[PDB]
Each structure stands twice: as structure tokens, then as C-alpha cells.
Amino acid sequence: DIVLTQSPGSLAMSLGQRATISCKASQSVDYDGDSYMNWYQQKPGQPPKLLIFAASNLESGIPARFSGSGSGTDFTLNIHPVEEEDAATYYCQQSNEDPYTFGGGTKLEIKRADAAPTVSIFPPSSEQLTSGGASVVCFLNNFYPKDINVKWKIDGSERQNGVLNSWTDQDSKDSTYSMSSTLTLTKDEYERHNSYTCEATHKTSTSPIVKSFNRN
């Protein structure tokens, strides 16, 4: 089986710059005068979309910002004017020898200016409390870079058990990230405490961003 190795595995490029992705094949994927190296873009929740075929041909409907090069065992994909919508994972692919094989994929992050998260905390809804549960939800929205730390404090004491986090993929329009942090307790647990605090540590502030409420 022809093994395709992509490099880098992860890449961040500023808006309008050039992104370059390399694909190295264990055996040649060019045959006679033809090449069977193809490049695809996959955005979250979507099937892959063909960008380049036969290692240098621009697929119809794909902007000329995408281009490919190389032969034999070494190929490259170039994205000049990198744009916000280009945030995706990129795959090289070989159609030379059965079985067809894919590269491991290269995730492209679009660089942008720093942005502090917009943090909102939500006490459990009354309906959930009637259901016997108590989820305290904290939204940390539209921040950049993606590295962020969330601390949950209950009556001033740090809490780690019962926290579940979810991150959006990079926004295709403004290149920001968003995150939800949920502290789930039982109703009995939740009513044994007064102060609930969601603490965000991000590069845009030397002091943590604090949102809090009292059960009352």
C-alpha cells in the first residue's frame, strides 16, 4: 500500500498569507505521463471536496487560490491568499495503486487578531431542577487564540468533577473560537452551595475573566 505522509499536521497562517502543505508518498504515484495525486478540502460536518486532481490541475469551481505541484513521491499543495473560509482539514490522496490511500490530513487554522471571550453564566433552569438535575452552563464565545482555561469555583473552592467542555471549530467567517463549559450536579448537590463561579484564563488578560452568581 502506498503510504502518504503529510507535513505539517497542523498549520496556522495569517489572513492573506500563503499556506503550503506537503505530501510524501512511500512509492511513486505517477504512472507513465500521468499523475494520480489529488487534494481535498474537508470542513466540519461535510464530505471532502476535490480541489486539485492529477497533482496540478485546478478542479472546476475551485478558486485559483489553490494550486498543486510535485511529481513522483513528493507533492505540495499551496493556498495563496489564505482566507477565513479556508479553515478546514486538507488531505492528499493517491489513485495510482489499489487500495487507494489518503494522507493523514493537515488542519489549517486562519490566524487573526487576539480577541477576549464573551463569558456568560447560566443557573440551572427551573425545569431541570424539577427534573432532579442542575447543570450550570458557561459560554465563552468569540475568542482567539483557541487556547483557554476554564475554572469552576463553588463557594470559592475549585471544582473539577462534573465539568464537561465542548469547543466549536474555528468560525469560517470571523476565525474565532467558542467554548461551552457545563458543571453538572444533582439538585441536592446544587442547593448545598451558594456561590457559583466560571473563571476564564486567556492570553488577552493577565487576570481571569470571572462570571458568577449566588443561588439565592
Binding site: 500521468d34 499523475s35 494520480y36 495525486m37 489529488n38 481535498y40 474537508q42 461535510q46 464530505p47 471532502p48 471536496k49 476535490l50 486532481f53 492529477a54 497533482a55 490541475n57 478542479e59 488531505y91 490522496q93 489513485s95 489499489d98 487500495p99 487507494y100 490511500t101 489518503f102 494522507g103 493523514g104 490530513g105 464573551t118 456568560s120 453564566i121 447560566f122 443557573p123 440551572p124 433552569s125 425545569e127 431541570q128 427534573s131 438535575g133 447543570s135 452552563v137 459560554f139 464565545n141 464537561l164 467542555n165 465542548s166 469547543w167 466549536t168 467558542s178 467554548m179 461551552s180 457545563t182 453538572t184 452568581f213 439565592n216
Partner: protein, 219 residues
């Protein structure tokens, strides 16, 4: 236009079999290959095999011999993949795609189906609870909608029947108590809400769950 429409998401017990369909239109079905690709959650792309509907010829990846069977229906322009002896590790999205035929076209897969998500699990279909998240009892206000305890994927969530689309963050589900939980946030101008109606709409088709939850200020 070339279009490949795949069947919807499937929940299958471990050890059972699943047969997923790929319906083609907009091109001569009997003159192009149909390829099938597997993508485990969070992972890359793995090629399964191809079928040529013109004569029924097939080729299978060695790793998928004995587990995948490719068939094609000429009378309905539909390709099928059956997967057998299903394992929890077989939970993945399976794509059908057609490949270029002409010389110098790299045999690239130029048209793709939307993908069919197969969940292999003995867990039972479960309807979620939907909770409206009002702010604690600025220029903008953020509201939330919590969809807790459903199985299997997926759910769809909209705000004001999809009319309210900007300022929305719907987060990927996480596994909680052997079930799925997701939340969504919507942010609007403070003069907009409490004064204008804002409702989160949730559908979990597997459990026929269809819920509207209007966000109301806390008391």
C-alpha cells in the same frame, strides 16, 4: 448536476448488519465508478473499495474483505454498501463518491455524497430534555438552550425557526451519562430581549422529539 444522495443516519446493534444506499443523478450511472470511504469520529479518511455499475465489477480493500459488500441497482441508479459483523469500532461516517474516468484526470473523486453516520451500540434510543437558559436573575444579552440526554446522534437546533441565525453558537455534543448533551447560545442586542420573543427549536428525529422552548426572564 451530479448529485449523490445517501441514506440517513443509522443506529445498529453490535454484531448486526447495516446496508446503506447511495442514489445517483445527473450523470450516466453505468459509466462511472462509485467509491466508498470511511471516516471514524475525529479521524482521517480510509478507502473501502469501488464498484462499476456498468458491469457489476468490484474491488475491495484488503482490510475490508469479508466485511463490506458493494452492489449497484441499475433500475434505480443506486449503489449499496452492506457492512456485516458490526463492531462498536465500526461506528463512523461512510461516504460514497464517484471518480473521474478520463485520461489525465487523476481518477480523483470529484463528487461526494453527504455521508451516512452509522452508530454501532446497544444503547437505546432516548429522547432528550430541552431546557431554556435565561440570564442570571450590557449592550448585548446572551441566551441559551440545553438539550440533555439524547441518543443516538443527531439533533437539530434553531432559534426562532431558523430566522435568528446570526449570533448563534451551537456546540458539538458531548457524552454524558452514556447519552449525548449539547447546548446552544444566541446573543442579541439588549434592547431586543426581553422585549422580543426568542425561542429555541429542537428536533431529535430518532425519538420523534420536536420541542419549542421560549426563553423567559427569571424570577
Amino acid at each position: 448536476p451530479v448529485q449523490l444522495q445517501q441514506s440517513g443516519p443509522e443506529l445498529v446493534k453490535p454484531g448486526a448488519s447495516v446496508r446503506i444506499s447511495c442514489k445517483a443523478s445527473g450523470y450516466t450511472f453505468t459509466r462511472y465508478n462509485i467509491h466508498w470511504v470511511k471516516q471514524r469520529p475525529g479521524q482521517g479518511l480510509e478507502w473501502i473499495g469501488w464498484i462499476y455499475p456498468g458491469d457489476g465489477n468490484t474491488f475491495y480493500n484488503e482490510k475490508f474483505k469479508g466485511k463490506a459488500t458493494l452492489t449497484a441497482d441499475k433500475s434505480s441508479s443506486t449503489a449499496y454498501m452492506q457492512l456485516s459483523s458490526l463492531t462498536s469500532e465500526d461506528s463512523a461516517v461512510y461516504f460514497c463518491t464517484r471518480s473521474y474516468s478520463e485520461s489525465g484526470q487523476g481518477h480523483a473523486m470529484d463528487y461526494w455524497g453527504q455521508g451516512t453516520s452509522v452508530t454501532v451500540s446497544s444503547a437505546k434510543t432516548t429522547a432528550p430534555s430541552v431546557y431554556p437558559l435565561a440570564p442570571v436573575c450590557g449592550s448585548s444579552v446572551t441566551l441559551g438552550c440545553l438539550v440533555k440526554g439524547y441518543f443516538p446522534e443527531p439533533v437539530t437546533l434553531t432559534w426562532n425557526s431558523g430566522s435568528l441565525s446570526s449570533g448563534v453558537h451551537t456546540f458539538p455534543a458531548v457524552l454524558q451519562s452514556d447519552l449525548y448533551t449539547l447546548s446552544s447560545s444566541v446573543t442579541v442586542t439588549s434592547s431586543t430581549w426581553p422585549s422580543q420573543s426568542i425561542t429555541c427549536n429542537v428536533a431529535h428525529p430518532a425519538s420523534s422529539t420536536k420541542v419549542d422552548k421560549k426563553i423567559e426572564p427569571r424570577g
